[PDB]
Amino acid sequence: PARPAHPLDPLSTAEIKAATNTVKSYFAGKKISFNTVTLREPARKAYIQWKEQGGPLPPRLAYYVILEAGKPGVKEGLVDLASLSVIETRALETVQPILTVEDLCSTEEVIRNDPAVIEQCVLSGIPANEMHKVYCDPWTIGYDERWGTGKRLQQALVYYRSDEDDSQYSHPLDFCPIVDTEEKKVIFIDIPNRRRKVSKHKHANFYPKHMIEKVGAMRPEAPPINVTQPEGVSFKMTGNVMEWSNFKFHIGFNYREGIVLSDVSYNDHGNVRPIFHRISLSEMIVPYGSPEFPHQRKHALDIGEYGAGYMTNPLSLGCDCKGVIHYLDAHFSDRAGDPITVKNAVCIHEEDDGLLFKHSDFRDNFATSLVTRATKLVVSQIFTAANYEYCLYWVFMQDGAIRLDIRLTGILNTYILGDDEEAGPWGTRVYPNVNAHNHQHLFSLRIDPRIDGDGNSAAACDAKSSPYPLGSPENMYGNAFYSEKTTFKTVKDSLTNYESATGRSWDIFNPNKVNPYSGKPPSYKLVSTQCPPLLAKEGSLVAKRAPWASHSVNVVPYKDNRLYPSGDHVPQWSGDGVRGMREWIGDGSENIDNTDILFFHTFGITHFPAPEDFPLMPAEPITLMLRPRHFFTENPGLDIQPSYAMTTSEAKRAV
């Protein structure tokens, strides 16, 4: 195909096709199907040389994952787009790949047409002639020791709608069909010892017509609040490259991680200084807390099992982004090797963010005063994973800080509850016969830093009282306290958790440089507090398949292609084996001090459902920030025009 403007640009629909064509040719005569066709980003070293040392343009490569009918597992490899050839390929017969919307969408019809499933519905109080009202969310089996990776399986969380417009979640069924993805047939049905027939209650619906019926009527439309940017926006985009408030970076996107920000830097009044080479969400795990069979299989690693890209919502229509928006489209490949597009997958825009800073002198009753307002750049995406939606917002700020805001909304995963059955301690009865199980939403932020250049380190920062006691010459009044910096020398040293006791934060810094004022190295500080401990016991399915989740921080040596902490092919992996984070950690002895490192941060929330979350849940916020500390020698936004400003002398002139 034709090369892209930038080496990190996602593959075009043409490159995708050229790739699939190349692969189909390689496997001529073989009945292959496409699971993934995505960009294989260039080597970190190659890229940087090209970008800053006049190095050559890296080869435009494509990474693929295919399935061959009658063959176990998958086959993966690389295609060198320029020469249209498969330059690397291999078969992984004992692994299962990410579930595309294509392998997922057929499942509902298959269980609907399965005699066994039909009998269970009838048993459950649903006539065999009404199977059209039976729905199901297709999930990976997650992991079921009965089959391992010997069969590509899915589990169907079954629900019932008395009307197509209903929200099915108030009416879950009690059984769980296991489906062979490839064979397209139910191979087993998990049935509870205690049977619970369909709820006979009205569905808990949320559309206006439903509401008008539920409560008298809808609230009157409210006076509008219109946002307008008459002279345009202040950011400038050159292809996928963004430019705003001295920040400059490339906005990428892929089937798995979704948004990928790269080559982030800041123009420090002429001096363009690197901050991060790449940053994104590399994995997740949403572990449920009911120990009852088969609920252990509910611990989805959405990024690696479905893909934040594959599940993304086209943003335009819903009014998700308010204001002067700038969109980006996403391109994948379908099962056939043909490009597929999802319009407005990413939405870019700037908004007001209140005050940036302010100060007035009390001496002239605040006449002397200066106010500068703040505006933030937001790069967003919103994806749907069956019942829930994850709204992601990468936020850049005018003080040099970068923040990740997430908002969880959508619908609670629900299971059936008997008339006289207690939601017990593992879940909440949010509606008659509905049980919403406890669960955690955990994310793994992957940061590849380049804080003010190459050669970085990480450290834990704990606030501490002076060791000297009250009344001592050294701490006479006992108010002394400082910040204890523990820089990680070895991988093992970094495996740390957030501690409230010390208001812990983590620094990613450049030990090769010093701030001329403070004397400290330049750095970006991770200020994250929503760091839940992994509640699943050690050695549990959850803990094993998500090795990265047991620690708030995991810092390992950089290596090309160390992206996914739970492994490259996550579905149905048992958790046994040295891959992903477990492999990168090794024996924990590798050096991570003043070298090229990778920082994986686990953050998230623990959800204990309340009726307020049903039938549709109000957004729940999660945030984390990376602030520059000792990076600059003074506040960097002081040359931004203030909103208001009166000098002391001027206040005098005004009389």
Instruction: List, as residue ranges, the binding site for substrate.
Output: 300-311, 385-390
Q: Which residues are annotated as a binding site for Cu cation?
A: 439, 441, 607
Determine the Cα–Cα distance for residues 17 and 28; give it in Å rounded to an integer: 16
Nearer to a copy of itself, 267 or 561 (CB): 267
Question: Torsion angle, CA of 505/352/358/276, rounded to 10 degrees?
Answer: 40
Read out DSSP for 5-61? Answer: SSTTSPPPHHHHHHHHHHHHHHTTTS-EEEEEEEE-PPPHHHHHHHHHS-PPPPP-E
Is 636 within 8 Å of 522 (Cβ atoms)?
Answer: no
The residue number whose beta carbon is nearest to Cu ion equals 607
Report if residue 376 touches Cu ion, rule: CB under 5 A: no
Nearer to a copy of itself, 164 or 576 (CB): 164
The distance of closest approach from Cβ of residue 428 to Cu ion in the complex, given in angstroms and rounded to an integer, is 11
How many Cβ atoms sit within 10 Å of the Cβ of residue 9? Answer: 19
Is-catalytic flag, 160?
Answer: no
Report if residue 437 touches Cu ion, rule: CB under 5 A: no
Selecting among 302, 507, 593, 613, the annotated active-site residue is 302
Q: Which of 439, 440, 435 is nearest to 415 (CA)?
A: 435
- Contacting Cu ion within 583-612 (CB under 5 A): 607
Residue type, 35: N
Nearer to Cu ion, 516 or 618 (CB): 618
Q: Which residues are annotated as a binding site?
A: 300-311, 385-390, 439, 441, 448, 596-597, 607
Residue 526, judged by CB atoms within 10 A of its CB (0-12, 13-18, 19+), counts as buried
Nearer to a copy of itself, 245 or 554 (CB): 245
Determine the Cα–Cα distance for residues 571 and 143; give it in Å rounded to an integer: 7
Q: Which of 69, 71, 95, 91 is nearest to 148 (CA)?
A: 95
Nearer to a copy of itself, 395 or 598 (CB): 395
Cis peptide before 615 (omega within 30 of 0): yes
Report if residue 579 touches Cu ion, rule: CB under 5 A: no
Question: 415-416 and 434-437 as β-strands: parallel, antiparallel, unpaired?
Answer: antiparallel
The distance of closest approach from Cβ of residue 424 to a copy of itself in the complex, given in angstroms and rounded to an integer, is 8
The distance of closest approach from Cβ of residue 439 to Cu ion in the complex, given in angstroms and rounded to an integer, is 6
500 interacts with, out of a copy of itself, Cu ion, none, CB within 5 to 8 A per kind = a copy of itself
520 interacts with, out of a copy of itself, Cu ion, none, CB within 5 to 8 A per kind = a copy of itself
CA distances from 445 to 309, 326, 373, 451, 602 (A): 16, 25, 29, 17, 6
Is 496 within 8 Å of 602 (Cβ atoms)?
Answer: no
The distance of closest approach from Cβ of residue 376 to a copy of itself in the complex, given in angstroms and rounded to an integer, is 11
501 interacts with, out of Cu ion, a copy of itself, none, CB within 5 to 8 A per kind = a copy of itself
Residue 627, judged by CB atoms within 10 A of its CB (0-12, 13-18, 19+), counts as middle
532 interacts with, out of Cu ion, a copy of itself, none, CB within 5 to 8 A per kind = a copy of itself
Quick one: tokens of 14?
């043409």
Selecting among 268, 388, 454, 462, the annotated active-site residue is 388
Nearer to Cu ion, 152 or 607 (CB): 607
Is 486 within 8 Å of 460 (Cβ atoms)?
Answer: yes
The distance of closest approach from Cβ of residue 288 to a copy of itself in the complex, given in angstroms and rounded to an integer, is 7
Radius of gyration of the chain (CA): 27
Question: How big is the site for Cu ion, counted in residues (CB under 5 A)?
Answer: 1
The distance of closest approach from Cβ of residue 267 to a copy of itself in the complex, given in angstroms and rounded to an integer, is 11
268 interacts with, out of a copy of itself, Cu ion, none, CB within 5 to 8 A per kind = none
Is-catalytic flag, 302?
Answer: yes
481 interacts with, out of Cu ion, a copy of itself, none, CB within 5 to 8 A per kind = a copy of itself
Determine the Cα–Cα distance for residues 28 and 70; give it in Å rounded to an integer: 15
343 interacts with, out of Cu ion, a copy of itself, none, CB within 5 to 8 A per kind = none
Nearer to a copy of itself, 2 or 215 (CB): 215
Please name the residue that has the structure tokens 């049980």: 435
Please name the residue that has the structure tokens 């249209």: 84
- Cα end-to-end distance, the chain, whole Å: 71
Q: Which residues are annotated as a binding site for Mn(2+)?
A: 448, 596-597
Quick one: tokens of 366?
């605040």
The distance of closest approach from Cβ of residue 492 to a copy of itself in the complex, given in angstroms and rounded to an integer, is 21
Task: Point out the residues that are catalytic.
Answer: 302, 388
Residues at the site binding Cu ion, with contacts judged by CB under 5 A: 607
